[PDB]
Amino acid sequence: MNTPKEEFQDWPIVRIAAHLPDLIVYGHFSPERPFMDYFDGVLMFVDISGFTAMTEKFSSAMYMDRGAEQLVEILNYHISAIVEKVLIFGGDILKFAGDALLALWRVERKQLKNIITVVIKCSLEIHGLFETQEWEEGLDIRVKIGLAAGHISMLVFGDETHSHFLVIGQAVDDVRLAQNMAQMNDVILSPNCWQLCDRSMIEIESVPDQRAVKVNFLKPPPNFNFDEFFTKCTTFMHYYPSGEHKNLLRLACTLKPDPELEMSLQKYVMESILKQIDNKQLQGYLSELRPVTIVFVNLMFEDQDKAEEIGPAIQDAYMHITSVLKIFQGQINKVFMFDKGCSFLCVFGFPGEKVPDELTHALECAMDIFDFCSQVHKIQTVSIGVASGIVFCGIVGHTVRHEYTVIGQKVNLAARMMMYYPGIVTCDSVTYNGSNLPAYFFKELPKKVMKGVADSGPLYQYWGRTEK
Numbered sequence: 006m007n008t009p010k011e012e013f014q015d016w017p018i019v020r021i022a023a024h025l026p027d028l029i030v031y032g033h034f035s036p037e038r039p040f041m042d043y044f045d046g047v048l049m050f051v052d053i054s055g056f057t058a059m060t061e062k063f064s065s066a067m068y069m070d071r072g073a074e075q076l077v078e079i080l081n082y083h084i085s086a087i088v089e090k091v092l093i094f095g096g097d098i099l100k101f102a103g104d105a106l107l108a109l110w111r112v113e114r115k116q117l118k119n120i121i122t123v124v125i126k127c128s129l130e131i132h133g134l135f136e137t138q139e140w141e142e143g144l145d146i147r148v149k150i151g152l153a154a155g156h157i158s159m160l161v162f163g164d165e166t167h168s169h170f171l172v173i174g175q176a177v178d179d180v181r182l183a184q185n186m187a188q189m190n191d192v193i194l195s196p197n198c199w200q201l202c203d204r205s206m207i208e209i210e211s212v213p214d215q216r217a218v219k220v221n222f223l224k225p226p227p228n229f230n231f232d233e234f235f236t237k238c239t240t241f242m243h244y245y246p247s248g249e250h251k252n253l254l255r256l257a258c259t260l261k262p263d264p265e266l267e268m269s270l271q272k273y274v275m276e277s278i279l280k281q282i283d284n285k286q287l288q289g290y291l292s293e294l295r296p297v298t299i300v301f302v303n304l305m306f307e308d309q310d311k312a313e314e315i316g317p318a319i320q321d322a323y324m325h326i327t328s329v330l331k332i333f334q335g336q337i338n339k340v341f342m343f344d345k346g347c348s349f350l351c352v353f354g355f356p357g358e359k360v361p362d363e364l365t366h367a368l369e370c371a372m373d374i375f376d377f378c379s380q381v382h383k384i385q386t387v388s389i390g391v392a393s394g395i396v397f398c399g400i401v402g403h404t405v406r407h408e409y410t411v412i413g414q415k416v417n418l419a420a421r422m423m424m425y426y427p428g429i430v431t432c433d434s435v436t437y438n439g440s441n442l443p444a445y446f447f448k449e450l451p452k453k454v455m456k457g458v459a460d461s462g463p464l465y466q467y468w469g470r471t472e473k
């Protein structure tokens with residue numbers, strides 16, 4: 006008999022899995038919310054600020070109405086190369102933001118030392134991608150990399166239809182801190198990373214007023230062979246593609262239909278993405294430069310790392326946020342940790358979710374969220390930034406690992422406003438002026454210099470309907 010080859014690998018469940026890390030795809034955990042788990046690992050945070058900064062050049066009339074299509078194509082071209090590097094070095098891409106990719110190498114404690122060496126090598130090879138690269142002279146199409154290692158907690162929260170996950174704890178905080186010390190082309194190790202690493206492998210230098218260190222060189226011992234060392238490390242990599250599947254970038258490409266598994270995984274993925282996955286919408290429909298309102302919610306806790314207290318608090322906040330967003334077809338685009346705080350990137354006006362009065366509604370939603378979350382047990386401070394304007398939306402990353410992402414100056418502005426004006430609801434000038442709401446519902450705020458924003462415009466606090 007003939008033996009025709011090729012397994013079919015283009016099933017909905019495989020397409021859904023592209024949008025999720027192995028941490029979730031192979032997680033098999035309780036559908037109970039919140040769910041927390043604890044493990045150890047090495048984290049890599051790749052700052053792709055330099056790439057995502059391209060949204061405003063692709064806004065030019067020079068792109069003739071194909072700015073979004075050109076932006077997604079060039080971003081995915083460069084980001085795909087980073088993703089392939091991470092995946093081939095055995096890492097799990099946890100999440101994309103419109104500023105960073107976070108990857109994880111989960112291993113037992115005994116293996117942290119050797120896995121840091123693998124992760125450092127990967128980091129140097131990522132820098133290597135961009136060594137002789139730029140567009141229109143453009144100073145830096147380069148990245149900055151922070152590495153951390155140690156204890157990691159995972160939180161999964163959500164309701165019967167949607168799930169979100171976050172990683173939290175000191176290593177997560179550390180990787181953020183390490184990456185923001187980095188200059189372009191740097192690899193910064195967290196203090197704990199540097200304490201756990203194989204010091205014979207590397208030459209480092211001090212970072213002033215910091216215990217974190219910069220990798221100058223990976224200079225292995227004389228008889229060292231990276232390929233034989235990496236092979237030994239794969240013993241500890243549960244899902245590293247191997248044998249008949251050594252030609253695949255992800256074991257997840259081999260997932261077969263499994264309705265119980267697909268029911269679980271689809272909860273993490275936006276319905277408009279599932280529509281495309283199901284071939285019920287054109288594959289190009291979600292790449293767009295779209296006017297939206299960003300509502301960026303930051304929740305601060307007394308404790309940053311103890312998942313046991315913050316997990317219920319985030320779950321409670323989530324149940325409220327999702328009810329409020331439902332009314333106006335808002336979506337949670339991303340949730341992540343930023344310096345102790347849990348941040349929800351909410352978007353009003355995603356594709357096929359157009360509202361007329363997006364602005365009064367976004368403000369009213371923000372205040373509702375603010376008021377409810379302020380009364381949630383263990384939430385110390387709620388801060389919300391509301392900014393409106395044109396943002397790029399699109400599925401960003403590699404064919405085998407990508408996520409829908411929103412990128413733009415207005416996203417960065419809402420993010421900065423919630424950090425620089427903590428404990429209040431703030432909005433930009435577009436939102437304030439567009440709402441037509443009486444001027445006394447607002448307070449005009451002092452101008453603050455915010456890292457990464459060049460002239461925010463007048464900013465306002467949404468004070469609300471009453472003096473009280």
Ligand SMILES: FC(F)(F)c1n[nH]cc1-c1ccccc1
Nearest residue numbers: 099100102105107171172341342
């Ligand atoms: F992966 C999570 F869950 F999204 C996360 N948890 N903590 C930080 C992050 C994060 C990830 C990517 C960019 C920025 C932050």
